[PDB]
């Protein structure tokens, strides 16, 4: 199983932000999409998961062609999406969000589902918040719950969009352990982020976009040490 994106394109109202950027995630490979501010990284994610009408491109897994499938029929097959924006349920509780995503996993028993959710709540150090609702939280708790219910559905491959926004550097390490555990268990994670020091520590290959130009792609050591990456993105 290998998800591959081909030749993506978008021009919002004349402003072109995506111009022929083709990415790939293999069978269980942590892939980076690190780029500067406003560089269409979520816009690439929009087109890959099929939120918006792209101009031209191909989202082909090469065992399926999902170039014009909707949001769900490519995510029903195992391609998960995590929104950058604050996308938690607003009124349901943490246990409610987790068990509502896990209600839809119709391949287990509900006791095993609740045991899975107890693994989740113990796992993200959030289990004391079983009672609190969605908007009765803050930024870190919302990100931990969003990642928890997104990883709860267990797609074949997942596209993360700044999971490390407003979280303390210890839960970053927790999510690092969980991402590496699931990559060992066969999940190919694509991620954009801006916490560079704790982002490059987990990656395996790194598509590096700028304006619609893939200015680098390689091992995170030479991604750190490239003089054009240090020109465009690091400084």
């Amino acid at each position: 199983a290998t998800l591959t994106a081909k030749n993506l394109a978008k021009a919002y109202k004349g402003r072109r932000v995506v111009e022929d950027v083709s990415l790939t995630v293999n069978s269980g490979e942590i892939v980076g999409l690190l780029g500067p501010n406003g560089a269409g990284k979520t816009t690439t994610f929009y087109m890959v998961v099929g939120i918006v009408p792209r101009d031209a491109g191909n989202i082909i897994i090469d065992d399926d062609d999902i170039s014009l499938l909707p949001l769900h029929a490519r995510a029903r097959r195992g391609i998960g999406y995590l929104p950058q924006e604050a996308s938690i349920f607003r009124r349901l509780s943490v246990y409610d969000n987790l068990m509502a995503v896990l209600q839809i996993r119709d391949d287990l028993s509900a006791e095993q589902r609740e045991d899975r959710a107890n693994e989740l709540m113990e796992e993200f150090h959030i289990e004391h918040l079983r009672d609190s609702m969605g908007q009765s939280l803050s930024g870190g708790e919302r990100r931990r719950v969003e990642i928890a219910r997104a990883l709860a559905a267990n797609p074949k491959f997942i596209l993360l969009d700044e999971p490390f926004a407003g979280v303390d550097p210890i839960s970053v390490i927790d999510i690092k352990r969980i991402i590496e555990h699931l990559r060992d268990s066969g999940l190919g994670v694509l991620i954009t982020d801006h916490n560079v020091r704790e982002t490059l520590a987990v990656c395996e290959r790194a598509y590096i976009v700028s304006q619609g130009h893939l200015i680098a792609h390689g091992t995170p050591t030479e991604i750190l040490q490239d003089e054009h990456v240090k020109r465009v993105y690091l400084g």
Binding site: L71, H72, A75, Y81, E85, A86, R90, E146, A153
Partner: protein, 210 residues
């Protein structure tokens, strides 16, 4: 599971529209009548004297309006694009709207049929149209769900205006087709049971989206 959210906004909009004019019109009788005349069965009559037919029609109105408010304030909080990101469908929202729409259809049946003796007595002193209300409440709960796919990008009343406008172009034509003929077994042009199934395909072609 958003049926509590739709029912909450539903009761909100029904409460607003249940106040909005006939509470003034009940004030105009009762609030001056503590010095003028104090009966029970004059001020008590204004319920069935003012709101049989407004309460008959106001439930598809508050129905589609509250569902549009709730589902729009799921898309603009970007959360049904997580529900729908978990391999869901619009049809699960259609089933949720069907649960809400049968909760609204039973209130429709309450405020026509069982109060029929009460309404007929306290007002008097088309049965095709009477059974139109099942699909009249199913159509808009079927129809708001695709049109309110609108996102945080340009989300405004460019869908709320067709949501009201199609309610209008349906309902005034339904009253014009009820206007012909008469009452009971009097036979008009038989098209009042056709036009809702005509708009069925209107609520289907912009919804199924193949």
């Amino acid at each position: 599971y958003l049926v509590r959210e739709t029912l909450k906004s539903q009761l909100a909009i029904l409460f607003i529209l249940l106040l909005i004019f006939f509470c003034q019109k009940l004030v105009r009788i009762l609030g001056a009548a503590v010095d003028g005349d104090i009966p029970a069965n004059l001020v008590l009559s204004l319920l069935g004297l003012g709101v049989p037919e407004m309460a008959q029609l106001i439930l598809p109105l508050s129905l589609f309006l509250g569902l549009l408010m709730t589902l729009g304030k799921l898309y603009t909080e970007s959360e049904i694009t997580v529900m729908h990101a978990c391999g869901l469908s619009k049809a699960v929202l259609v089933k949720a709207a069907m649960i809400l729409a049968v909760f609204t259809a039973i209130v429709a049946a309450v405020n026509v049929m069982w109060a029929g003796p009460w309404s007929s007595r306290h007002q008097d002193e088309e049965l095709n149209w009477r059974i139109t209300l099942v699909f009249t409440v199913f159509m808009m709960a079927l129809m708001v769900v695709p049109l309110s796919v609108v996102n945080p990008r340009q989300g405004r009343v460019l869908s709320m205006l067709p949501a009201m406008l199609l309610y209008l172009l349906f309902f005034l034509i339904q009253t014009s087709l009820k206007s012909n003929g008469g009452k009971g077994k009097l036979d008009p042009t038989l098209w009042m049971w056709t036009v809702n199934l005509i708009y069925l395909a209107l609520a289907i072609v912009l919804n199924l989206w193949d």
